[PDB]
Amino acid sequence: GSSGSSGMEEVIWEQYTVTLQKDSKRGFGIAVSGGRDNPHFENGETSIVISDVLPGGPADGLLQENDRVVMVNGTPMEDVLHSFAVQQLRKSGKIAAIVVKRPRKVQVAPLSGPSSG
């Protein structure tokens, strides 16, 4: 059933495709938590999310914490096992491509510019 024409305070989910380099050991300096069977997400989200982003590695900047992972090197991380998500990471030689999405609430900002001293 559906109440009717509804849709307010929506959110624009933008995707970000960044490439990470397998550092010495930390490699992609990232960690995944959750799973389609063990969604730690207190709320309940069967979507792999980065619960760790090496603040001093390759990830620091490219990716961020809570980066709803969607695809990885051409693999859907939606409704997948935690091991399945990491697998791709360990499989990726040294460079991997991850596509995460971030909630960009519908906001509006005026016109700004430089400032004096």
Return the CATH number at 98: 2.30.42.10
Measured between alpha carbons, how far is 90 from 22 in angstroms, rounded to an integer? 10
Total domains, the chain = 1
Measured between alpha carbons, how far is 104 from 96 in angstroms, rounded to an integer? 25
Method: NMR
Measured between alpha carbons, how far is 86 from 81 in angstroms, rounded to an integer? 9
Identify the residue whose tokens are 């799973």: 35
Strand ranges across the sheet with 68-72? 11-21, 95-105, 68-72
Identify the residue whose tokens are 């980066």: 67
63 strand-pairing partners: 60
Domain housing 79? 1-117
Asked if 91 and 74 count as a contact pair (C-beta separation under 8 A), the reply is no
| HEC profile of 56-112 | CCCHHHHECCCCEEEEECCCECECCCHHHHHHHHHHCCCEEEEEEEEEEECCCCCCC
| Residue 50 CB neighbour total at 10 angstroms | 21
